[PDB]
Tab-separated table of C-alpha atoms and ligand atoms in Angstrom:
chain	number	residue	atom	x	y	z
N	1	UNK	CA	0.000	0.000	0.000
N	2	UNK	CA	2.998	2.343	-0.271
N	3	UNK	CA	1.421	5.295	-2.566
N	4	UNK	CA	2.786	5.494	-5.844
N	5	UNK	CA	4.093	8.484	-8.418
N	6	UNK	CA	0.924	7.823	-10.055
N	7	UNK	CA	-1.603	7.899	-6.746
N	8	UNK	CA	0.314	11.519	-5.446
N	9	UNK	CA	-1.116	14.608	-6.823
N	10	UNK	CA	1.535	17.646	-7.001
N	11	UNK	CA	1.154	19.624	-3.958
N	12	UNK	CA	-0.099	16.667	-1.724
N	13	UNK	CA	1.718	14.656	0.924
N	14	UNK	CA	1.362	11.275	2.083
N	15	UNK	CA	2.300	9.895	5.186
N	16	UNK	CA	3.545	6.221	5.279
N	17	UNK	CA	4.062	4.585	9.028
N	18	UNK	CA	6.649	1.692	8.844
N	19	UNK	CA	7.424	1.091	13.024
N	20	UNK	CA	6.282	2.743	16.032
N	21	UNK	CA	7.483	6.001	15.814
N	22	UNK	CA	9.134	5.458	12.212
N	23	UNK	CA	6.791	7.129	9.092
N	24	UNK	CA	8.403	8.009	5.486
N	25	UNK	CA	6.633	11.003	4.136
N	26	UNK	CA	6.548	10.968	0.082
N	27	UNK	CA	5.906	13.666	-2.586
N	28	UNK	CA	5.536	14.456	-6.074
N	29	UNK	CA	7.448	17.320	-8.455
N	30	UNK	CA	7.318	18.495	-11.989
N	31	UNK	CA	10.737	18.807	-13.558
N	32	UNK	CA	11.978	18.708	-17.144
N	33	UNK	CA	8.127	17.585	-18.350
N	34	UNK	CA	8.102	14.182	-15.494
N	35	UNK	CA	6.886	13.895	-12.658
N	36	UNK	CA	8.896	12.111	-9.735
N	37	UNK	CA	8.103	11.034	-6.941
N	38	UNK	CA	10.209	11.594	-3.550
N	39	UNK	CA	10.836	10.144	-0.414
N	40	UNK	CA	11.826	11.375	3.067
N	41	UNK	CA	11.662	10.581	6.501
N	42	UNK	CA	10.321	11.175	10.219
N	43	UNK	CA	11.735	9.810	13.545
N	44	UNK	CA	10.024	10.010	16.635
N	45	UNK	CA	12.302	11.581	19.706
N	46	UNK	CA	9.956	11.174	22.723
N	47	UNK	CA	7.656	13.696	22.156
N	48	UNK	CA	9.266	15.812	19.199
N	49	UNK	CA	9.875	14.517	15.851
N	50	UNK	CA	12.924	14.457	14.039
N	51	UNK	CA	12.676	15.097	10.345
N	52	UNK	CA	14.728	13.457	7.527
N	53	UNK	CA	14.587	16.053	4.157
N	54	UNK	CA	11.894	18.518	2.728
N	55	UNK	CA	9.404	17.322	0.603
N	56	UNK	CA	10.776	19.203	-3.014
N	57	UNK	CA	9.771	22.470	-2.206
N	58	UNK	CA	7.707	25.031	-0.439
N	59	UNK	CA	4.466	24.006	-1.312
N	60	UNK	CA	5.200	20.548	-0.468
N	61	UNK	CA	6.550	21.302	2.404
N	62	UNK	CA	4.063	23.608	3.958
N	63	UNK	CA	1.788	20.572	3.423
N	64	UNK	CA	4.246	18.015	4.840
N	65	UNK	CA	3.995	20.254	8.328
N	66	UNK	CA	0.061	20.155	7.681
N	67	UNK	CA	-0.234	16.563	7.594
N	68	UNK	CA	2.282	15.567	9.972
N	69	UNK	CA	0.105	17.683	12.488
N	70	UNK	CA	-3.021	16.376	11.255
N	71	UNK	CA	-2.058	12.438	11.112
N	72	UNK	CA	0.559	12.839	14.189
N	73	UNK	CA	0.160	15.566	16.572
N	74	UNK	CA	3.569	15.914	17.378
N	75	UNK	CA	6.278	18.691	17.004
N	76	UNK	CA	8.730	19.245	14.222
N	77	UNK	CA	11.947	20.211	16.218
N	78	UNK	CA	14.850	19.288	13.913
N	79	UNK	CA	15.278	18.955	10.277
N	80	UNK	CA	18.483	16.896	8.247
N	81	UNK	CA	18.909	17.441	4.219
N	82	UNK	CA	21.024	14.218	3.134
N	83	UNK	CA	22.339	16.339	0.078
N	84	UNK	CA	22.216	19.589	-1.473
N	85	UNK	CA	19.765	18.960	-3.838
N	86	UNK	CA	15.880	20.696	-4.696
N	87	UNK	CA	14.177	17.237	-3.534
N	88	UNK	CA	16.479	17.727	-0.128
N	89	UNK	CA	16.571	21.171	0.651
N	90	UNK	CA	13.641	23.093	-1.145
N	91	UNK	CA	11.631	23.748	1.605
N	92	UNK	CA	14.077	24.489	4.172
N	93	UNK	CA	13.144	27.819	4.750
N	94	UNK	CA	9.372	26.875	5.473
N	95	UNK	CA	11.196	24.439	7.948
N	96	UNK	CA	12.991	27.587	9.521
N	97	UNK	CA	10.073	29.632	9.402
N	98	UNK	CA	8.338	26.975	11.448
N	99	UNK	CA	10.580	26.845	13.970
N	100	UNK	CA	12.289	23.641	12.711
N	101	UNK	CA	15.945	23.268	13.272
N	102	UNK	CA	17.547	22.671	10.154
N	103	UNK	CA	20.945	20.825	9.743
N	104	UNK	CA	23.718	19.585	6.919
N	105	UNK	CA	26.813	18.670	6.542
N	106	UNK	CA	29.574	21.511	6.013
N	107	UNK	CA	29.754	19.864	2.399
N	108	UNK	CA	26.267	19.929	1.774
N	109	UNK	CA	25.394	23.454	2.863
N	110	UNK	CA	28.324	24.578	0.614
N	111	UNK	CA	27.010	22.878	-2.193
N	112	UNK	CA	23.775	24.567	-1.913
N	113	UNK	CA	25.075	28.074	-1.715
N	114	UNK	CA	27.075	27.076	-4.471
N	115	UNK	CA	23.974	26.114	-6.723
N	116	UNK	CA	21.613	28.646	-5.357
N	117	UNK	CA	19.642	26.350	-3.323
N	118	UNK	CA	18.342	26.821	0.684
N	119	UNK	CA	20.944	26.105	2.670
N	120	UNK	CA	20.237	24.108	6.242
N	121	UNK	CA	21.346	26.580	9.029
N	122	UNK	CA	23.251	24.041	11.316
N	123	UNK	CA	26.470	22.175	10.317
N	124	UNK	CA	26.070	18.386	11.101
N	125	UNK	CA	29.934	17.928	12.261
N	126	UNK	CA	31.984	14.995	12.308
N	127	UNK	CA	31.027	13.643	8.974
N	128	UNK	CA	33.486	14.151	6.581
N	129	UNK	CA	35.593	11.450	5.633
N	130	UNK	CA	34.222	7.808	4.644
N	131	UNK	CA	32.867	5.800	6.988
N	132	UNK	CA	32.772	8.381	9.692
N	133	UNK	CA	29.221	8.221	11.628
N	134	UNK	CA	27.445	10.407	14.644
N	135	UNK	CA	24.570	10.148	16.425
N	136	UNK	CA	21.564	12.335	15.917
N	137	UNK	CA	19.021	11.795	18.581
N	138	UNK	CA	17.112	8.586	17.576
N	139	UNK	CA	19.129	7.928	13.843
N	140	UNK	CA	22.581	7.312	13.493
N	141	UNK	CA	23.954	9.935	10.574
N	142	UNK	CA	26.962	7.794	8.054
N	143	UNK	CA	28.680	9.123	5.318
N	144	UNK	CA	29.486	6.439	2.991
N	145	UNK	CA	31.921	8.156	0.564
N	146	UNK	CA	30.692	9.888	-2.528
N	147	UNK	CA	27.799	8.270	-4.457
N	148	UNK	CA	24.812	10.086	-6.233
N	149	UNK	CA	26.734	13.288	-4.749
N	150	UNK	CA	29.745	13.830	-3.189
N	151	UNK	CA	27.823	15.013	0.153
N	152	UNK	CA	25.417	12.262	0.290
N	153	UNK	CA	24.341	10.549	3.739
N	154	UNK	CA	22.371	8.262	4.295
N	155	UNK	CA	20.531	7.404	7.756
N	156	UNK	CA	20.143	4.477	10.539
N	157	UNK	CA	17.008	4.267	13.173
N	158	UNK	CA	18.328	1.337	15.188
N	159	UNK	CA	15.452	1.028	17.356
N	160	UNK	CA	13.376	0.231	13.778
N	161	UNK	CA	16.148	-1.685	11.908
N	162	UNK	CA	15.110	0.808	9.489
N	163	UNK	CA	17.881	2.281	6.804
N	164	UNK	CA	17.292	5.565	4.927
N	165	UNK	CA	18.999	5.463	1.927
N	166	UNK	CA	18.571	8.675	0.111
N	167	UNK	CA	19.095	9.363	-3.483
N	168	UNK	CA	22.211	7.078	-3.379
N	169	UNK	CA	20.077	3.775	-3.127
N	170	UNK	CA	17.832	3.433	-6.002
N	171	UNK	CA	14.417	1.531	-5.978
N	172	UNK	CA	14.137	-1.839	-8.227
N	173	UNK	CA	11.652	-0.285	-10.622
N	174	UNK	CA	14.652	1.969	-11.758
N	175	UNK	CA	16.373	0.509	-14.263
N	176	UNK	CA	18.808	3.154	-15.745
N	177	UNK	CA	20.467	6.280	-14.185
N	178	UNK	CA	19.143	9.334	-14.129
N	179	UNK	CA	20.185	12.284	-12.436
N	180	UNK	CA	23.807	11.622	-11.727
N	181	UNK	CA	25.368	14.876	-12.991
N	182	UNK	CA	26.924	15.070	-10.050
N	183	UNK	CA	27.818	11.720	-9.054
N	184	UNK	CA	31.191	9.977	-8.617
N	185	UNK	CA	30.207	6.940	-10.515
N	186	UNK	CA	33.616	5.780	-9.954
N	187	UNK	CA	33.154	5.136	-5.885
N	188	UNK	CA	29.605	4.900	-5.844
N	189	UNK	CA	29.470	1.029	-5.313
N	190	UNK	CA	32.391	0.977	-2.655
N	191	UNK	CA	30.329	3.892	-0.948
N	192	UNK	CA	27.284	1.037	-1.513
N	193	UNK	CA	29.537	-1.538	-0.047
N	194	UNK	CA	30.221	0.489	2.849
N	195	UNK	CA	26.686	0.904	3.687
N	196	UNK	CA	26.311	-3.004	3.458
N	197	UNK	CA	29.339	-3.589	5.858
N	198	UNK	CA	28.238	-0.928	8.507
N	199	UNK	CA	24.288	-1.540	8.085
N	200	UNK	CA	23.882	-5.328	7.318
N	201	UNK	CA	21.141	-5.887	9.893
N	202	UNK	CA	18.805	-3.897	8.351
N	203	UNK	CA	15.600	-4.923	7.472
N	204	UNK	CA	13.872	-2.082	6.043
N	205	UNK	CA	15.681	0.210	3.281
N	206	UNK	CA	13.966	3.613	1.767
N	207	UNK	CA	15.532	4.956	-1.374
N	208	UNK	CA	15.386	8.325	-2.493
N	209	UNK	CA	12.329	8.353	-4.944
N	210	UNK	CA	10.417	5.134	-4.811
N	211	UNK	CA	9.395	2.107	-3.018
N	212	UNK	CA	10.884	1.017	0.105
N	213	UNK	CA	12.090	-2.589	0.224
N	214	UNK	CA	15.068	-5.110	1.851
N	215	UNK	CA	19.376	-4.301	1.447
N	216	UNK	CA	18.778	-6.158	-2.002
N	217	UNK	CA	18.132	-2.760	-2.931
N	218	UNK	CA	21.963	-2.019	-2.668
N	219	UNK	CA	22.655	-4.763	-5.249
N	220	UNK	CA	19.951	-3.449	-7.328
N	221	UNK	CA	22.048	0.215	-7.485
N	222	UNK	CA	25.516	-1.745	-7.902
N	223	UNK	CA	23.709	-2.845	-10.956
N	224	UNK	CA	22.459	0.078	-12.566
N	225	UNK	CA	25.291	2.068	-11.469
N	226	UNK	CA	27.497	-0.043	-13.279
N	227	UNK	CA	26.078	-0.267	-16.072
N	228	UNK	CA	25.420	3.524	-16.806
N	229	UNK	CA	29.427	3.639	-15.910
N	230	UNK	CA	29.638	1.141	-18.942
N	231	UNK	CA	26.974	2.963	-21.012
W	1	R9K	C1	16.850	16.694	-8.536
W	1	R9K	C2	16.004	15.812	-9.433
W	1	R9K	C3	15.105	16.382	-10.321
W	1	R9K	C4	14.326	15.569	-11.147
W	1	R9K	C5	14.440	14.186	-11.085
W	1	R9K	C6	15.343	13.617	-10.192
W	1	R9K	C7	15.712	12.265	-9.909
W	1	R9K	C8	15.074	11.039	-10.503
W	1	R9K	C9	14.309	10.270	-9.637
W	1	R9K	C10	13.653	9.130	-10.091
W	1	R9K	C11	13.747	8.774	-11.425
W	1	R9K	C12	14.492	9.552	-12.292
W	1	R9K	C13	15.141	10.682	-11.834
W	1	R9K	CL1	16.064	11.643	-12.938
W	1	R9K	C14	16.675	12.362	-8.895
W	1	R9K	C15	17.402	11.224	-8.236
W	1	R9K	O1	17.604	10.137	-8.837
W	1	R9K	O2	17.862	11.387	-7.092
W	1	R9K	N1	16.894	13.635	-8.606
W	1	R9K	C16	16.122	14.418	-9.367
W	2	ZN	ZN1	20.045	14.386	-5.647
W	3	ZN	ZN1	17.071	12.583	-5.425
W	4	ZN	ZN1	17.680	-4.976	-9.831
């Protein structure tokens, strides 16, 4: 029953619970004549919630805040973008209007000024070489190495066994690239690896755009990745 690209009007939000305490929150934009969908996520923290990327802009966002305080009832307190990217960080400033505080890495809030995009006003530090991982409240935050961006992280909620991948994990029903203009395709399946080797217990994986399923998911992207390298 996960909703679909198809099922999501632009503008609307749906809310998708996977644990106690655990929900993915998913989205639909325009962009170059598509429509994609998008995925984020939201973490319970006794009685705040801890928010995992924007939902692709202000409008979706304004009705992310609507629905998480229709369906859940609980506070937004803190906000992470996993990259610098529109489907990560549009929205931020409805975030920081809000109250919500927003966080990235050094990297990532770089990249955003750098691109014109809103930039997350907390640095998340500790996160910048390879393997390197912090806690943040009720996630762990890892940095795999450069992948679908140089900046990318991806996210842990060990009390869910449940593994955010971000736009570095791709969902099966992808079958070629697409927006890896700035990807390092050349480390993007070690980065994958080192996901695998730090996360193997987990049960529950969320991609980017797309549906949700198991760490065969991170085979799936070794696959597609290297065969748009060999393209
Ligand atoms: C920033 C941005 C704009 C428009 C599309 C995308 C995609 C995408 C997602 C699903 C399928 C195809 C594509 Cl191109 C990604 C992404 O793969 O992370 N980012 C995007
Ligand atoms: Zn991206
Ligand atoms: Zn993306
Ligand atoms: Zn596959």
């Amino acid at each position: 029953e996960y909703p679909t690209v198809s099922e999501i009007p632009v503008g609307e939000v749906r809310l998708y619970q996977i644990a106690d305490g655990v929900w993915s929150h998913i989205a639909t934009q325009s962009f170059d004549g598509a429509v994609y969908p998008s995925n984020g996520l939201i973490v319970r923290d006794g009685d705040e919630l801890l928010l995992i990327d924007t939902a692709w802009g202000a409008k979706n966002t304004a009705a992310l805040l609507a629905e998480i305080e229709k369906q859940i009832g609980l506070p937004v307190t803190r906000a992470v973008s996993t990259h610098f990217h529109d489907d990560r960080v549009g929205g931020v400033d409805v975030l920081r209007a809000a109250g919500v505080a927003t966080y990235a890495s050094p990297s990532t809030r770089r990249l955003a000024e750098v691109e014109g995009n809103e930039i997350p006003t907390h640095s998340l530090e500790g996160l910048s070489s390879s393997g390197d991982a912090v806690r943040f409240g009720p996630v762990e935050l890892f940095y795999p190495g450069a992948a679908h961006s140089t900046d990318n992280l991806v996210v842990y909620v060990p009390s869910a066994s449940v593994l955010y991948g971000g736009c570095a994990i791709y969902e099966l029903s992808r079958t070629s690239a697409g927006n890896v203009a700035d990807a390092d395709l050349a480390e993007w399946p070690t980065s994958i690896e080192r996901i695998q080797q730090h996360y193997p217990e987990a049960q529950f994986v969320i991609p980017g755009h797309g549906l949700p399923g198991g760490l065969d998911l991170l085979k799936h992207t070794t696959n597609v990745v290297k065969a748009h390298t060999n393209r």
